[PDB]
Amino acid sequence: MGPGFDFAQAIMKKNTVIARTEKGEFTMLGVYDRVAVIPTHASVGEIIYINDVETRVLDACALRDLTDTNLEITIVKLDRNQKFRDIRHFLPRCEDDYNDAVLSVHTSKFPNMYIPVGQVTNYGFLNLGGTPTHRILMYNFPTRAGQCGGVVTTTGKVIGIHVGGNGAQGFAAMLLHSYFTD
Numbered sequence: 001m002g003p004g005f006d007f008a009q010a011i012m013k014k015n016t017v018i019a020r021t022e023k024g025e026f027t028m029l030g031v032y033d034r035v036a037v038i039p040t041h042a043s044v045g046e047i048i049y050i051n052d053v054e055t056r057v058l059d060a061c062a063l064r065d066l067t068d069t070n071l072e073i074t075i076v077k078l079d080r081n082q083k084f085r086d087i088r089h090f091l092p093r094c095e096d097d098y099n100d101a102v103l104s105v106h107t108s109k110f111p112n113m114y115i116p117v118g119q120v121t122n123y124g125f126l127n128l129g130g131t132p133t134h135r136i137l138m139y140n141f142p143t144r145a146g147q148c149g150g151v152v153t154t155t156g157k158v159i160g161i162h163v164g165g166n167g168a169q170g171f172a173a174m175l176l177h178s179y180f181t182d
């Protein structure tokens, strides 16, 4: 409808795949080469399904901060025959608050879905499904599930992936440039 949805659409069309683990379906954001992110609660194993194709996982790392606290981001390298468009220059360098954000979700149940969630707070600490978690972004999200792995963008920045909600708010794990320096 506007430049928010325009940026979101451009990220969803080129940089998302459908990931399926034993824990269900996830929006998965490709960042560069064969490297993607998914919420840690997806429990990635040795094999994952990518757009319904059996794919060997070459490496998978559940990120934690330097206090050894969960960040809820798993970085996955996929044994895929094709690279993602490099979107590392759209990642923020520092923890921040944001205006006018959009959550975008791509699944086999919820095709091409874009939610204007609006103002995003640097919330920080959250007890997420019983797990102490840091670098949480918080927004208004009065709904249900199937969003997990959904990508949170502003105009010009990819700022997080959706990891949960309490029926009134939604929560995203920050994406930072320094996670994907190589």
Ligand SMILES: Cn1ccnc1-c1noc(C2CCC2)n1
Binding pocket: 105, 110, 113, 115, 141, 142, 143, 144, 145, 146, 147
């Ligand atoms: C139905 N569904 C499936 C995935 N996401 C949603 C959804 N519904 O409403 C919303 C928010 C509440 C205001 C817009 N998200």
